[PDB]
Paper text:
Tripartite α-PFTs are members of the ClyA α-PFT family. Proteins in this family undergo a large scale conformational change from a compact soluble structure, where the hydrophobic residues are hidden often within a β-tongue motif, to an extended pore structure with the hydrophobic residues exposed in two extended α-helices which insert into the cell membrane. Here we show that S. marcescens has a tripartite haemolytic α-PFT (SmhABC), and propose a mechanism of pore assembly. We present the structures of the soluble A component (SmhA), as well as the soluble and pore conformations of the B component (SmhB).
SmhA folds into two distinct domains, a compact five helical bundle (α1, α2, α3, α6 and α7), and an associated head domain containing two helices (α4 and α5), and the β-tongue domain (two long anti-parallel β-strands, β1 and β2). In all monomers, there is missing density for approximately 20 residues between β1 and β2 (G208 – A229). AhlB and SmhB use both a short β-strand and a short helix connected by a loop, while SmhA uses only a short loop perpendicular to β1. The second region is between the N-terminus and β-tongue, which includes a family conserved glutamine (Q38 SmhA, Q32 SmhB, Q45 NheA) on the N-terminal helix α1 that forms hydrogen bonds with the β-sheet backbone of the β-tongue. In SmhA Q38 and in NheA Q45 also interact with Q263 and Q282, respectively on α6, a residue conserved in all A component proteins. In addition, both SmhA and SmhB contain a family conserved (conserved in all but 1 sequence) lysine residue at the C-terminus (K333 in both SmhA and SmhB) that forms a hydrogen bond with a conserved hydroxyl (T81 SmhA; T78 SmhB) on helix α2. As soluble SmhA, SmhB and AhlB all share very similar structures, we propose that the head domain of SmhA would also unfold into its pore form about 2 hinges in the same way as seen in SmhB and AhlB, with hinge 1 between α3 and α4, and α5 and α6, and hinge 2 between α4 and β1, and α5 and β2. This would result in the pore form of SmhA having a similar extended helical structure to that of AhlB and SmhB.
Numbering used by the authors: 2 to 207, 229 to 366
Amino acid sequence: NNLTSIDLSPQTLMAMHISISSQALLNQSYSNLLLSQQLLTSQSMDPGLTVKIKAYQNQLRQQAQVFKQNTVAELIGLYTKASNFAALVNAVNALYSTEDPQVSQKGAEMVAALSDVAQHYQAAAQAVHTQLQAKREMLEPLMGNFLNVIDAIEQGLNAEAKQQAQTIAELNEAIAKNIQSIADAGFKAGEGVVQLGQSIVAAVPLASYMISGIQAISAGASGAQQAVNELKANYAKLAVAYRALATANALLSVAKSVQAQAQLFVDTYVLTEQRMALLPTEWGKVAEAYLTAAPIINQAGSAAEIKQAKQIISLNAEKWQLFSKSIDNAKANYAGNNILPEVL
């Protein structure tokens, strides 16, 4: 109705871009893990299962490469649009720093213009989300069929081997939680520099399929020290379980190691897609607010009404600059987290 009711703020955009970065950065590291993982050779012995494992491994590696190189760039592109918008709000602020007597009209047209820009960023986000949802609809059936392959083999295992399979599944779920604790401590809700590494954590004899796993960098300064000690303990026990299950069915151990790497990639893809689902609607809310504000900013034309508009605009400009720094940080993480360095 009047100046006090307009919302020129970034609304939930800052928190949403942090929650997106949270999962997308981790999924960047899981992509590098799938790409670093030694390929299974045609050891044969059981060529049927080997083809099925290699097929899934190759299809996952191809999807990890598409996320690492294409999807990340597409997200960095969305974040750049948020930076751009922040600059435009800061331009509206720069306008009000002049003693133009017709500032109310020039200001209202600029806000009405940003309204249209927000509507475009809405469409830009919707495009990325459609791409993410399309792949998600392909990755779930792919993983589901591979899980049917594993389960079909497991129903025919002896008592001891079926238990080594349960133990592997349990530790893979435990190690996931450990990695999540470690990454969240490094991320500090968008203020930190998320950095994870990798190493050979286990091996299955055939001559030797060597399984890669995520590790913390700086086993001394990474927030959640509890999680690092659990991770080392869990990897040690995981290595035993694989060597054990391998005496019964070696390629089953390989298959479970591949599925564990996939579970992390597909689960974090799905979370990245669900955090992204809300972004179009939010840009839409910014577009709707800016459109409504325009006529109100125009009516504020008295010396005092202008001073009050300048005040509101300057406050929302500072809010957008704080979000613009949150974006620069996220963009620097995506850049620096492109490499998954080795650890000993």
